[PDB]
Design a protein around this ligand. Sequence first.
Ligand SMILES: Nc1ncnc2c1ncn2[C@@H]1O[C@H](COP(=O)(O)OP(=O)(O)NP(=O)(O)O)[C@@H](O)[C@H]1O
Ligand SMILES: Nc1ncnc2c1ncn2[C@@H]1O[C@H](COP(=O)(O)OP(=O)(O)NP(=O)(O)O)[C@@H](O)[C@H]1O
Ligand SMILES: [Mg+2]
Ligand SMILES: [Mg+2]
Lengths: 466, 466, 479, 128, 128, 54, 14
Amino acid sequence: TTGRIVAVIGAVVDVQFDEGLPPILNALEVQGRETRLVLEVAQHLGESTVRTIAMDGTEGLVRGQKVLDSGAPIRIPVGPETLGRIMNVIGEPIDERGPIKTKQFAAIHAEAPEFVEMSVEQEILVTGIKVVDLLAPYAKGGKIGLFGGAGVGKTVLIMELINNVAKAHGGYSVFAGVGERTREGNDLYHEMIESGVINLKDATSKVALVYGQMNEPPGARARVALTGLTVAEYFRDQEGQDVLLFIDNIFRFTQAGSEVSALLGRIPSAVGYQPTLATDMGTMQERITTTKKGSITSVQAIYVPADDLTDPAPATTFAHLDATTVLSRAIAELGIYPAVDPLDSTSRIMDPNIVGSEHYDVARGVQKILQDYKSLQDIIAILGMDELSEEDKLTVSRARKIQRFLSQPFQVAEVFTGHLGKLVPLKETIKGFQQILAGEYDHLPEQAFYMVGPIEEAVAKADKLA
Amino acid sequence: TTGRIVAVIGAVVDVQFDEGLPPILNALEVQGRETRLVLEVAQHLGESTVRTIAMDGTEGLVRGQKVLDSGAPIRIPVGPETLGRIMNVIGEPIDERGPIKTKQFAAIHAEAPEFVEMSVEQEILVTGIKVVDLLAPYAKGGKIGLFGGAGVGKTVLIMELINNVAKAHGGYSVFAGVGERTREGNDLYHEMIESGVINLKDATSKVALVYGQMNEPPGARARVALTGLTVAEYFRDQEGQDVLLFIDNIFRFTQAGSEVSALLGRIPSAVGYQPTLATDMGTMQERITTTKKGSITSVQAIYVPADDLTDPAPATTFAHLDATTVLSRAIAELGIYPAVDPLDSTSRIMDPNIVGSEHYDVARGVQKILQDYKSLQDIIAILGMDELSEEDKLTVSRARKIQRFLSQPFQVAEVFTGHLGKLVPLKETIKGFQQILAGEYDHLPEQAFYMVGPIEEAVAKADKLA
Amino acid sequence: DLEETGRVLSIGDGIARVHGLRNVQAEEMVEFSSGLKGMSLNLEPDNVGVVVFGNDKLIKEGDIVKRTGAIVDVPVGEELLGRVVDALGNAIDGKGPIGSKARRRVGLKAPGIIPRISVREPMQTGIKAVDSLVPIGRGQRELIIGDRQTGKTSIAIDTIINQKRFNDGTDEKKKLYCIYVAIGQKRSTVAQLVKRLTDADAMKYTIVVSATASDAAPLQYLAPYSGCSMGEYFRDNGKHALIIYDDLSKQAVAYRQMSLLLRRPPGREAYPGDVFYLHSRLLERAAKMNDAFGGGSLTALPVIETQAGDVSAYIPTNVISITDGQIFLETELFYKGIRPAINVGLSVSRVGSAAQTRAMKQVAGTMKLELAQYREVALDAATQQLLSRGVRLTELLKQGQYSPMAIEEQVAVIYAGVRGYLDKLEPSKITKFENAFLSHVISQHQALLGKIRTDGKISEESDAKLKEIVTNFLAGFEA
Amino acid sequence: YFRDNGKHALIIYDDLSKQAVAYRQMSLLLRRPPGREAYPGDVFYLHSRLLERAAKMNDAFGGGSLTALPVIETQAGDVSAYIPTNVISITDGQIFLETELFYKGIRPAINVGLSVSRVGSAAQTRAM
Amino acid sequence: YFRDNGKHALIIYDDLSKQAVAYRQMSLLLRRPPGREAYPGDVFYLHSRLLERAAKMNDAFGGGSLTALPVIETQAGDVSAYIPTNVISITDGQIFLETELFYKGIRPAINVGLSVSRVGSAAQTRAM
Amino acid sequence: ESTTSEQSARMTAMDNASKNASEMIDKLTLTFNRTRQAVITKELIEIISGAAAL
Amino acid sequence: LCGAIHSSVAKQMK
Ligand SMILES: Nc1ncnc2c1ncn2[C@@H]1O[C@H](COP(=O)(O)OP(=O)(O)NP(=O)(O)O)[C@@H](O)[C@H]1O
Ligand SMILES: Nc1ncnc2c1ncn2[C@@H]1O[C@H](COP(=O)(O)OP(=O)(O)NP(=O)(O)O)[C@@H](O)[C@H]1O
Ligand SMILES: [Mg+2]
Ligand SMILES: [Mg+2]
């Protein structure tokens, strides 16, 4: 149909249609534009006017300008042909390697899998990261969440997971860049090309890329997550394959939404956010799941505004995950990396019937001594450790050794740690912490446990220290 | 043009005009009233209607009452006739001394000197006060934060500042009492008279007074700093003087800004201040500088809400301060007058590249001797001042002399102390403290350096005391 | 002509509501009867909301408003070098007009993924602490973060002044044009800043966009973008620019005032939901182009002022999550006389490593390591040795203002320290030693300095001679 | 239905924290002005109305009953905040759990001093 | 009336916190813009116009006087709240009371350290 | 030897403990003032949202 | 609160 822009306010554009008003979620096409400018119908204002959200900048738009109804929501290219390419919210290619020829085009708007489609197979996903594997194990086909304040370690943790999980993976991988750093997209792209995971010649690429970084207007950042998820949906279903979905950073979806929600005319909810925050988030995260038809292991980085974990965004995401890895600025500052909070990172898999009694018990022992130490922190603070019970000194000492043994040198982080990357097998992780708990290394200096792999290196570093 | 009142809501009055709509910032004379009622246009609401802020009570106003547009912003008498006279916000005399007939008036609203009119170098305004000129010098055309309160010689300092600037520079002074308590405004008048910085007979008054009393509506207290500033600019622009502007107190200038903003219906920003916090302050402050014809140096009394320096009010203020002068009850009690805290008072121009390397080395040298003494004091009186190394014996003795030499008789107190005030030249100051650090006067009694001017007077007192 | 013109319906709260202008575009500039310019922000059915780029007092109901047909843009090109302009690109130095031959929208979108490449060319600041521990590369975004009066600007200024050695040299690749955007500062401070740059002969290759404390909020808001566009000209023409945003905290407050006046929903600290995006779209524009796009770059050094060291506050965290690392300046080190007041351990450079000269890696890498050992500690010979380094090395990192050091002179002095030629020396003599040793090599050993510079590495040959030089100097260094 | 027919039912509302958030969204979207914390001015009534429906019927009314276990998610362990105290001011007691207790090995992480029952021994067998 | 006819009067405003509440009711229902704590921008003006009417008149004006002892109730010791902040700044001095002192046995519960009088000695007899 | 040692130790211990308390006071004051400001802001924005929604 | 006086002697004493 043919409509006319009757109002433009940043990313929100109102279009008036004489006949055949376009339904909600329908992608409209602005006419008289060099590049494709899509407007998604968000609501029907009445008087034959619809309120929409632009997927690109609205500069240059004039009142009266013509808009066509495409007849359907934003549809993108889905299929193997997306592997090794990079697209934007609206599915166009942004790698300068020409068109994306697919048979199928899926809409980025799909209803979530039904309750009868849900899977319930609990299976551990060993990452080789001591802290995660011990305290809050990830699961295959489960939902993993990396929480973190600015600069704390989310992106390095995701890249380390890609390196450990994705590499040794039989299946396709989808990486959605959402409101983050374009230059990280370029690094990712070239890193993937160099490794051979993105082959620009053979048809052997295993990763599909989708980006909408911090350089995009709100409307595009609010939908890129849906775009890369739609690509992951196909591989999951239309191919019955184990898909991996990495998103950095999913918070940017919610933040994109607050920016337009104001322009959409809604009364603001707590902290200035859109009153639809949780439902917007829900209809999207419910699509990011494993189904009986296929499995998707998702890893989403989640930005924590002002480091406040109670902020509506991060707070609402907790219920969408099966395992959480919560990163702390204070932990990072102590030099511990990855800066995981051992007392705030949880997992539904952390059950004696799943990870077994030996693993469950050591994890619980580690957390008990960390919590007990945490209690003494205040007392240590004022009077130091000399007016401390000989009994408590020992908890403190072990805790500090456990606290340092939780740290690990990552490949991706080699330049910052000054240490070779390590990948520790679950069995070795359990043993290391068992032994420290048992007081077997009450004679080694804490420092020996810092930045190593298996406990064996701790001992070897202790001798090195003389 | 003549308009008509269409709305009266407290201190906010809406006036409609037929033709010739008064621009924003214009002054409107309400017709048919005992006292002069000025309205300042704040906004153009549309429909030939303007929204204004009242400079006085609005009680008795009727809808349709006539309001004449004066064709310009608020204009006040500016020039030498203002000296020793107390003025109101809108330039009216409030001292019962008849009119303030100047050759011309001037608009309280002006843009700040252009980038091309700025002085390109950092000069110093010698005030002739040892603590200040030595340790935290005033920057010519700069802003000085006067931290103090009552009971610490604030008024004596101010009056002395005025007196020293008039004599050592030929520049006059202006006092803007922003939110002045009437009682405290009457006392300071007669106090100024007693000191002589004001004179009811001759034309020797060095100070002009502008008062925005607390009784007055928000609009009045918000504009007084501007009225006083206009006065000061007159002596800088038309007589190339180096004026001194006192703002007491800068915090009540902000608050009055919040109140006006509130009444105008603007949404409040952090901690309840006006969205235009930084702009309200910058447009006023930038008028205070060194131009190519002269300069305005402003001593601004500061009140820090909740003792929170990071509060939006004080933090916004500090952006414009070039120095701080700290008056302390403690220092006062040691009998050191002025009660200027030598280590708290700071200054930006206290830079080798600006006040010279000599001055810099002596200033620091005094600062350090004082800091060391502070440290040592713990041992001195408590742990017994006996086991003090040859070095420590001298640090304490010199420090105490220097600390005493930082006091100085003000010409203003003369009438009460029966002692000639001493206006000490920067050169004399530098020499003195330099010599005491050197050790040249390590053979005189402390009291010799107490309440003197030039170092010579220190030696002289010593001999007389024996 | 209500197609190309409008009449002001209402003016107040900064936005003017314009009647007409039927054919204006969104984000297009319009002109006011008073010569004031504005930007068409909200195209509503019955009016156009205009952001006035200046004193809105100069606007009245009835005033004609004319279209320009151009989306907000600014003068651009080498003709701006040595000039001081306002947020609109108008000269304010009183030196006549700018003969700019091109214009560039202030709002262009930043280069995408394909045109970029990882930073790899050093952006030498000339400041030892930074070129060793927090090495900046060209096309990188590096935040300068700290409380007021912690010497944030100073870092920016030394870096600008350091470029003189490149800009006046032969090698084009090594050149770097500078742009200093002053946002919310005082006029005085800007005037003094251009005066210092003039005396340092660094103004010739420097553009200064100024929207100071007296300028309307919309000018302070725009300033950063206009300077950024002026920087992109270089970026995209195979050249290299450096832009400074000083500071972005004051810009965010100007945008906050505009947003509350627009009655946009106040959130965290009463900031709008788009404060992040305000800085994200801006900083994304500094980038490093690959050879197929000319090989240029635009390095950005945004400045953020924290309150009482709170780097966890909303704005600070926002920029930190945009940039590639930050240099934190601690109020406490500054006071303690440690200048520059950089906090090593908390300062990071995510991508500069690859752009750090090899001569630096050979001494700076080992220096940082030794700084870590020291940090973990401050009796026992072990720990004692570690503590010895700390004080020495910490003194080495001290540097005055206005004397940016060449890279070869930085590796030379740091070598002294990390190699051990300072351990048997009194801590308080270290800075004295540095200054005497520098002059010594700069004069009696230009050949060696030039060797290290040219080779970009300290080879065995150079290292042998350098070893001799330091040792010889120690022997002759009087207490 | 059980309660009014001689039968006994147990109901779990997991959880009422997210319910009130859905209520806020819907109410804000209906143009009703945000009250305290952006929640509608009758967030207490939202839950109070619901929870009162759980009850003990007398014999004349079948002797059936409905027992309620509403769940509330606190933030940073603050049982004293507005929403939590609203629901506590409805129910006949509370079971407060804490992460500190949990990790210390106190599981279930019941905080005795802060939890209460407003029925007491009337709901226990003599033995207990 | 007393102040002006050469007499002396003392007035107690018990308390200005409640009058301020009263005015806030009228303002908010008048739809005047709300500010900090929902007070209007003229609430400080409201108390400053009243407290300046307390004054010491000069001989030529009869020599009368009006002394004002306004009362302000704080919440949990918050002397920085809006009304308290205002009235504290308008006055010549404050007599701060504290519960802790009260129950400790110090009655009247006057905090001797914080309470001040800018007038001080100027209104104290020689022997005191 | 005992009495000397004990007093040296105690002196040291208390000196350090008062220092630690000082730093903790400074840090708590900062937190106090951040919270005080967030509270003011948060309460005010509730008032405005309610007002505006009419 | 004697720093670590007591602890030292007691440990070496038993
Ligand atoms: N595992 C790690 N080992 C060592 N340093 C690390 C590690 N993770 C993070 N860091 C340090 O912190 C920096 C930021 O890491 P990064 O993964 O980019 O953070 P982030 O949480 O994604 N930040 P942002 O996206 O900006 O909010 C790195 O460049 C390192 O200096
Ligand atoms: N490296 C340095 N060595 C010695 N003094 C320095 C150095 N850097 C700065 N200073 C001094 O410290 C002052 C403050 O530095 P400046 O660059 O203005 O800090 P800032 O953090 O940008 N301040 P402001 O913008 O006002 O909050 C300068 O005027 C110098 O006198
Ligand atoms: Mg990241
Ligand atoms: Mg600065």
